[PDB]
Amino acid sequence: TQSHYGQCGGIGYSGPTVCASGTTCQVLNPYYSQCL
Numbered sequence: 226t227q228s229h230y231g232q233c234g235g236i237g238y239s240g241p242t243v244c245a246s247g248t249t250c251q252v253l254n255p256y257y258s259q260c261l
């Protein structure tokens with residue numbers, strides 16, 4: 226589970242995609258998404 230400020234899954238990012246409860250995956254850019 227992706228911690229706060231971690232990359233939650235942009236294009237190609239097959240790592241931790243689900244953010245910690247309370248943090249939401251914010252797709253900031255096509256490849257950069259951050260759990261906020």
Ligand SMILES: *[C@@H]1O[C@H](CO)[C@@H](O)[C@H](O)[C@H]1O
Pocket residue numbers: 226227228229230231232241
């Ligand atoms: C949030 O936590 C993940 C591991 O769960 C780590 O890879 C991230 O870098 C961190 O921000």
